[PDB]
Design a protein around this ligand. Structure first.
Ligand code: FES
Ligand SMILES: [Mg+2]
Lengths: 135, 224, 26, 100, 215, 14, 49
């Protein structure tokens, strides 16, 4: 027969119960496969409701320590002349090179961001990178 | 006397192995990452997709690919077992950028595709639309679960009414509550959609060939 | 454990609040 | 020694790009409908740009072009809506052709 | 052939048409059940009463619930629910109690296979809400096994007719917890005044516990 | 049981 | 009248990949024409009604 009450339980729960009651003479082809390798969540219909009051989503903003460096670099110099190639997975931008040098100089043990930022720029200038400040 | 042995050696045997068709090898987390398997903006987020979202990078939901891998493993395993069992697999999608790709993939793997406007009652009124002896699909794989007004494809509800299991790529703005085997992933980027098609086409093809190999061995042995 | 997990910060790229032309002028 | 998903995300080119506003990127014209040029720059969605009049002939399927990104996805919430309306498209300005 | 159908309501609904004025239609509620837990209901509409009966009967069988019956004669626990403006409070009863409930619930219970139960319907006595509410509660009742699995503890039945004998009706299929459930001195549970009032012999009704034919 | 008059062979009989 | 043949065999598997659309002939034709246009794009009256 079958049960079209898609909002009452799941296809397996409904199918299993009807086979047990004897309503379904033969269990469907997928039944045995489902039972052997079930999904992580049973597919039960549930109603989406609006969050009211103080309820908030648990999704958190993805941040990293180097974002502070990237923000400062972008403000001081702007978007690098080199165009970002997002197709290449290993592409490094001028800002990424700055972060790397900045981090390398952080390992040396500089404790002042402003001094460390100045030293980072000087090393890149020596390597031949073009760093045109917004000014 | 012979049917039970045939069924045990063929139909019940594959169900005793965790990965009978070895679908693990078909994909890795790296391959999924390189295909941009990237969610919609946080303002488009569906509440039921929050468990699958890793986070929001500048208001762009990032799907957790570690969950995708476990969900995809279960989806590809279920698809292979159904193809091995000679089940009718129907691919449904209303994204018109990929209608041609999806229709070819179905024809190539010997399955069925429905990429066109879904007329009311295709599944719940099939015996009137097609005929009294029509056989409905045994599995429905949704490559895009939303219709062209950003609402759940009607077939998701109707598949559940007909007790048909469903595999579905569910982006961050989709509702996975009624999809049996949801796979959280990007459903917009061509690279992502091209990967799903390659993965599901390979799993179906492999499963069908395995069924022929197992049946052949059983028959050759049966005679002698 | 792992060091690549996102950390909790205030948006570093957040732009400063805009100001009207007469802001800070009597 | 398997790279974790978080590791891949932290070092992804898109992460190091950060804010996409006014970021120059390189795209590829993957589909062309009359003047309308459909360009892929590696984001979730493509960006549609009108064929530049100066050198329209040069812009053909596969040509690599320089873009200035404005938004990765055009979305907004209008009066009375429960979720953002989405155009399923990126906003960008076609600067020119990339030449090596 | 196993399923039996029984009508629940027949109503002469009307709409107004420009050409003919009052257009009479028949709305029919029917319930189908094989008597072994599988039972459903549907609404059939047609100008002719025969067509309405057929449509409802055939459609109800495609919308079958499965009702968990304790020992195949009663519900597992007492269910109190409100569906829209209809309140149904069902009580689990011992064998031989009978179906002491609204005539429509009696009909549905015979189709489901419940032999012993008590139910009081309050609020609106709409037949559509009652049926839809009854199937909503009976479908959502938790079985003793589901309770043991959720709680990881044995479910022990204490029967007055069997003295202190502890009858284990369900055990946790998985691991059995070793910590006893915290015994709250005073249970913070919402009590129905009508229950408490009866237990205190404060309820005089000339209509309660009247002798009735076997149901 | 009240017997609903049963339908004959479909009259239309396409 | 010209009647279409049975679209599924004894196993019940339909014979056309676009069977479940209900317009396998029409949509198969539309699919073919779209494919030809794609290939043509990648490569590049009075009497007739
Ligand atoms: S913004 Fe107007 S007073 Fe500051
Ligand atoms: Mg999407």
């Amino acid at each position: 027969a079958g049960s079209r009450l898609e909002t009452v339980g799941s296809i397996f729960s409904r199918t299993r119960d009807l086979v047990r009651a004897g309503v379904l003479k033969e269990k469907p082809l997928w039944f045995d496969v489902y039972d052997a390798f079930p999904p992580l969540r049973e597919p039960v219909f549930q109603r989406p409701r609006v969050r009211y009051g103080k309820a908030k989503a648990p999704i958190q903003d993805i941040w990293y320590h180097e974002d502070r460096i990237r923000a400062k670099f972008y403000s001081v110099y702007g978007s690098g002349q080199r165009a970002f190639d997002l197709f290449n997975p290993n592409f490094k931008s001028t800002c990424q090179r700055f972060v790397e040098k900045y981090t390398e100089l952080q390992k040396l043990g500089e404790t002042d961001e402003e001094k460390l930022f100045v030293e980072t720029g000087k090393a890149l200038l020596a390597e031949g990178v073009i760093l045109r400040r917004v000014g | 006397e012979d049917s039970t042995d045939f069924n045990d050696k063929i139909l019940n045997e594959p169900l005793k192995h965790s990965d009978f068709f070895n679908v693990k090898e078909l994909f890795s987390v790296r391959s999924l990452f390189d295909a941009r398997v990237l969610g919609h903006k946080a303002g488009c987020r569906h509440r039921f997709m929050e468990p699958y979202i890793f986070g929001s990078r500048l208001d762009h939901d990032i799907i957790d690919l570690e969950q995708t891998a476990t969900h995809l493993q279960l989806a590809l395993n279920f698809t292979a077992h159904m193809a091995y069992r000679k089940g009718i697999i129907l691919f449904i999608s209303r994204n018109r950028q990929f209608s041609y790709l999806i229709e070819n993939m179905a024809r190539d793997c010997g399955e069925y595709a429905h990429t066109r406007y879904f007329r009311g009652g295709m599944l719940t009124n099939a015996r009137l639309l097609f005929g009294p002896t029509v056989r409905l699909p045994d599995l429905i794989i949704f490559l895009h679960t939303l219709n062209n007004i950003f609402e759940p494809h009607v077939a998701v509800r109707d598949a559940a009414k007909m007790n048909i299991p469903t595999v579905g790529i569910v982006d961050t703005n989709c509702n996975p509550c009624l999809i049996t085997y949801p796979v959280p992933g990007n459903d917009d980027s061509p690279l992502a959609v091209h990967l799903y098609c390659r993965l599901f086409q390979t799993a179906i093809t492999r499963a069908k060939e395995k069924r022929q190999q197992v049946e052949a061995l059983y028959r050759l042995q049966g005679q002698k | 454990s792992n060091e690549d997990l996102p950390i909790s910060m205030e948006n570093p790229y957040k732009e400063p609040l805009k100001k009207c032309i007469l802001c800070g002028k009597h | 020694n398997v790279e974790s998903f978080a590791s891949m995300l932290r070092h992804s080119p898109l992460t190091q790009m950060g804010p996409a506003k006014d970021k120059l990127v390189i795209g590829r014209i993957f589909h062309i409908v009359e003047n309308d040029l459909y360009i892929d720059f590696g984001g979730k969605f493509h960006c549609v740009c009108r064929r530049p009049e100066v050198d329209g002939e040069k812009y053909q399927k596969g040509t690599r072009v320089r873009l200035r990104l404005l938004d990765l996805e055009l979305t907004s919430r209008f009066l009375g809506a429960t979720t953002d309306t989405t155009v399923l498209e990126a906003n960008a300005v076609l600067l020119g052709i990339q030449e090596s | 052939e196993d399923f039996d159908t029984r009508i629940l309501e027949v109503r002469n609904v009307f709409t107004m048409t420009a050409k003919e004025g009052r257009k009479k239609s028949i709305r029919v509620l029917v319930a189908v059940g094989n008597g072994k837990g599988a039972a459903g209901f549907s609404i059939g509409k047609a100008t002719d009463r025969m067509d309405a009966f057929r449509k409802a009967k055939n459609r109800a069988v495609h919308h079958l619930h499965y009702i968990e019956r304790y020992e195949d004669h009663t519900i597992f626990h007492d269910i109190s629910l409100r569906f829209k403006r209809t309140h149904i409070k069902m009580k689990k009863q011992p064998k031989g109690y009978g179906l002491r409930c609204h005539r429509a619930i009696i009909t549905i219970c015979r189709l489901i296979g419940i032999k012993d139960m008590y139910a009081k319907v309050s609020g609106s006595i709409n037949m559509l809400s009652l049926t839809q509410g009854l199937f909503r509660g009976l479908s959502r009742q938790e079985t003793h096994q589901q309770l043991a699995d959720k709680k990881g503890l044995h479910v022990v039945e204490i029967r007055e007719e069997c003295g202190p004998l502890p009858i284990v009706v369900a055990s946790p299929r998985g691991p059995l917890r070793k910590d006893p459930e915290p015994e709250d001195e005073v249970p913070d549970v919402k009590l129905d005044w009508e229950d408490v009032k009866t237990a205190q012999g404060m309820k005089r009704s000339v209509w309660s516990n009247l002798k009735r034919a076997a149901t | 049981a009240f017997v609903i008059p049963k339908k004959n062979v479909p009259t239309s009989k396409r | 009248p010209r009647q279409r043949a049975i679209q599924w065999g004894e196993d019940g598997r339909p014979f056309h990949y676009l069977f479940y659309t209900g317009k396998q002939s029409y949509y198969s034709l539309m699919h073919d024409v779209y494919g030809m246009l794609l290939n043509l794009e990648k490569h590049q009256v009075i009497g007739s009604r």
